[PDB]
Amino acid sequence: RIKTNAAVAAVLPANEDQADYPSTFFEGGNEIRLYVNRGEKLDVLRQYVYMGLVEKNCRIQHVNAYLYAVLKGERELLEADWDSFGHKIGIQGDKIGPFNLVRVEDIPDGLPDGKLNAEVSAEDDAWLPLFLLGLYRVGRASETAYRTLLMESLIKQCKAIKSDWVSPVTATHKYFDVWGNDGNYLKIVACVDMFYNHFKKSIKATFRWGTIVSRFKDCAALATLGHVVKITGLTIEEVFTWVLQTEVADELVKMMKPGQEIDKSTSYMPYLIDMGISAKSPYSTIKNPSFHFWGQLVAALCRSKRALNARQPDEIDSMSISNASLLMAYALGSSPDIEQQFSTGNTYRKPPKEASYLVSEEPKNRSVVEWIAWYSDVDNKPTDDMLMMAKRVAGTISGPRDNSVGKWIKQTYG
Amino acid sequence: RIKTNAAVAAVLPANEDQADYPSTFFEGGNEIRLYVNRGEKLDVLRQYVYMGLVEKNCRIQHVNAYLYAVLKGERELLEADWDSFGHKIGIQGDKIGPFNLVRVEDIPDGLPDGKLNAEVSAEDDAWLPLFLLGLYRVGRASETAYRTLLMESLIKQCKAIKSDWVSPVTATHKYFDVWGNDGNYLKIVACVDMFYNHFKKSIKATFRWGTIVSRFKDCAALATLGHVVKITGLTIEEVFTWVLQTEVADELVKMMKPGQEIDKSTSYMPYLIDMGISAKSPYSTIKNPSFHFWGQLVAALCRSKRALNARQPDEIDSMSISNASLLMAYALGSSPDIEQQFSTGNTYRKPPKEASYLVSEEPKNRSVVEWIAWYSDVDNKPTDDMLMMAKRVAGTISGPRDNSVGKWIKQTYG
Amino acid sequence: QPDEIDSMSISNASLLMAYALGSSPDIEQQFSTGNTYRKPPKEASYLVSEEP
Numbered sequence A, B: 001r002i003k004t005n006a007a008v009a010a011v012l013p014a015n016e017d018q019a020d021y022p023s024t025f026f027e028g029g030n031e032i033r034l035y036v037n038r039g040e041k042l043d044v045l046r047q048y049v050y051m052g053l054v055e056k057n058c059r060i061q062h063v064n065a066y067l068y069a070v071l072k073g074e075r076e077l078l079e080a081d082w083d084s085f086g087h088k089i090g091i092q093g094d095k096i097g098p099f100n101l102v103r104v105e106d107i108p109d110g111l112p113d114g115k116l117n118a119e120v121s122a123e124d125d126a127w128l129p130l131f132l133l134g135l136y137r138v139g140r141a142s143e144t145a146y147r148t149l150l151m152e153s154l155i156k157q158c159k160a161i162k163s164d165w166v167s168p169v170t171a172t173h174k175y176f177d178v179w180g181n182d183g184n185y186l187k188i189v190a191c192v193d194m195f196y197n198h199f200k201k202s203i204k205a206t207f208r209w210g211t212i213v214s215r216f217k218d219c220a221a222l223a224t225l226g227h228v229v230k231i232t233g234l235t236i237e238e239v240f241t242w243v244l245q246t247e248v249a250d251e252l253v254k255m256m257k258p259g260q261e262i263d264k265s266t267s268y269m270p271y272l273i274d275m276g277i278s279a280k281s282p283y284s285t286i287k288n289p290s291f292h293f294w295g296q297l298v299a300a301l302c303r304s305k306r307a308l309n310a311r312q313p314d315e316i317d318s319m320s321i322s323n324a325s326l327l328m329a330y331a332l333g334s335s336p337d338i339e340q341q342f343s344t345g346n347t348y349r350k351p352p353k354e355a356s357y358l359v360s361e362e363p364k365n366r367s368v369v370e371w372i373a374w375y376s377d378v379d380n381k382p383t384d385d386m387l388m389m390a391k392r393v394a395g396t397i398s399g400p401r402d403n404s405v406g407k408w409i410k411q412t413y414g
Numbered sequence C: 001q002p003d004e005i006d007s008m009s010i011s012n013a014s015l016l017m018a019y020a021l022g023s024s025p026d027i028e029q030q031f032s033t034g035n036t037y038r039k040p041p042k043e044a045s046y047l048v049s050e051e052p
Helices: A041-048 A060-071 A130-140 A148-157 A177-181 A184-200 A203-209 A221-232 A235-239 A248-254 A296-301 A320-335 A369-376 A384-394 A405-412 B042-050 B061-071 B128-138 B147-156 B178-181 B181-199 B203-208 B220-232 B235-240 B244-256 B296-299 B318-334 B368-377 B384-394 B405-412 C007-023
Strands: A081-085 A087-090 B081-082 B086-089
Touching: A041 A060, A041 A130, A060 A130, A060 A177, A060 A184, A130 A148, A130 A177, A130 A184, A130 A203, A148 A296, A148 B086, A177 A184, A184 A203, A221 A235, A221 A248, A221 A296, A221 B220, A296 A320, A296 A384, A320 A369, A320 A384, A320 A405, A384 A405, B042 B061, B042 B128, B042 B147, B061 B128, B061 B178, B128 B181, B128 B203, B178 B181, B181 B203, B220 B235, B220 B244, B220 B296, B296 B318, B296 B384, B296 B405, B318 B368, B318 B384, B318 B405, B384 B405
Parallel strands: none
Antiparallel strands: A081 A087, B081 B086
16 A cells, blocks of 8 residues: 555456356256257167277267167156256156256257167167266276276176176276266266166166266365264354354355255256356355365364365465364364263253363353353463374374375374 | 765666566557468468478478468357457457457568478368467476476377377477567467457367466566465455565565556456567566565465475575564464354454453564564564474475575575 | 685674674565554663664
8 A cells, every 4th residue: 555655556466257156047947958969770879889989989979879869768756746946847646757857959960970880789788878977987087096996887897787798998098088078978967867866766776876976066165064064063053153264254155145955955956067057166165265174174183084185275374274173173172062861860960050160261062252262362372282182183194195184284283 | 985084985886677567568559460471271281280290390480370370260259348458359249259359460571481292181170289389388398307298288189089199299309499489479379378268168268278378477476476465364455564675665566557457357468478568577576586585485484385386586685584574474373363253142252452461472463563563572583482483384394496485494494 | 715815804794794684684664554663762772682
């Protein structure tokens, strides 16, 4: 602003972008528009899918037309009404099918260049769609040591008919992860995962291997909130209460938009990206950093092994968040939940209103106001008992990763 | 000045140069003047680009004429008006194209000496402009260990059509980094990067690989200011407030010239150099040293891993800047942001106006006046707690580089 | 280091100037929003090491 003499300064960095909620979609009653390639015999299409897959090149159009040709007609029961964002899916007591949420929308002239026909199988449907959908998940991986998903796939599909199977996919080739950029492939994989999540009693529900990574994709902050609610024993209101930063609170407020049907398991929200409803999800770690550092740091300091591998985001105010996380973890650990539950002929511990204990001035509950008063009494610095507890927690981490929460805990607190 | 008897001395070193802002350009309504070489068939031009690239010699004129021949006609939507420095780019609801910001300006007679024609491809546009634009970035590199950008390029373009590709570029040859001196090549690469940054939803936006290094080139001080704003949790006014050196303040004042449209993401400023708007950018580390030492040193003392690799500039007053950085980092770390944000039925910590605590006389906020009073009370020297905190921070640096901020921290503070 | 010069007195002067520069840095407040500088109320006496 104002310098020594009189000069005012225009203090300004560059701006940023935003994200789109699912409720903006379906405001004008839009549809999904899969743009299905179809109009051919299923048998020859399965031959185009088979041959070429033996060598090192397959076509996205071939597997697309196949998946619509084979997944159609697999109707199931419907014991209740299905609704999401006002879009009616099915009537109670009817047959539904996996491709009724999205209309077919026959594609314009973009028909693929087919090849010759191999020996006619007409029987490989027990493994071939499962193989393609699992190959999608294998292509979603990024570590060569994490290519045991392929070995799990071969273990799964080697017993497809009786015992015999030969793997046609190279363990090191990367010619199938390009298919993740195709919108129609994501739309069908989200369709089958959404439909077969509703009916887990079907025989064909084994196809959900590979398609599970479509559910809640780029929505890790909701899972972070659920994990920090369950791992501490607090209610959701208390978890929201114990937040002591304005950035984290603002991201929570932006994440709690009301009309997004957050709580409904049978809805369109967890398939936000692959359905094409939104391109920038407002529930990710990139959209909400430093709420992924909070919560995960709290759960790691509450001795949970999942949160020790969460990545620490860069370009966030780490030190104040670490102070708040240590305060909340120490407050949770100092005062546990030992309330008597069952009784035969006797009552509880009957506390006769102590309200004063100067051993460390610590309160006997998990209320945030008494704990923040006690923390401000000691000049907002970590007490020696807090650092001892943090060192004891950090001593139980064997090997941390490069940019993980566990590496931060081991480096910062001994 | 005056010696023992009466003699006055003329005390003077040599002078320096200056830098030119973008607002001096477009004051008389100047244009960009790409000076495009054109006037030929696209197919034969792509043959001149192809052959020769298989061997160890390519022509800048060939790839220039190609890039204009192939990038032209790729129009997109225009949902809003585009303006920068008064120069009108496009009308809302029209088709724009990547070469509408700059007129073509057909070149005088400097036509290149072409060679024979290879086998006619007419299909290699899926990789060849991407290969040239990424080869620009590979030529911008300076470390042989940092030649993994080439491997990333081959990984990217080996799946250009289906699976098969052979690399024509030698991993050790340096025959393409000369093209960075060509003004027209920089102008087109800045044109495509600027145009495809506005429309990220295009299919062809994959070409931005390689062209990202054109954006904000030689403008690292603005990124330093943004990083030090985000990494501390302070507002921009407080970041400007906490500066305690006259050289740093003067560089900030010179960096905050008002009429340069700093805040607008869709503007000509980040492409200051490659557009040819200015030759000496006023936002670089060379133009503004010791503001690149401040900020980066603060962020490194606030435990950020990006600032541990920033180069320490030579011929600056390092010791006073290090004192100010340690003071600001300790002041930020001593008093965090634990303000209660969410509530159910209770209020905040309700501080009853303490205003006096003689444990270390430390204030309870991040205001600079109380902290500078407290620092001047201890004779402007680093307190033992400050040195302990600096040693604790410096113990978390594993291996520093030669002239980095982390090497300075490890050497100076243990 | 040049030879045939009076090195010890020059080293004494260099150490004195370097210590004087390092003991008293430049922490003058430069930018302000609604507050003034450290307002030193004319101490002029500090016997911890008698340093200016």
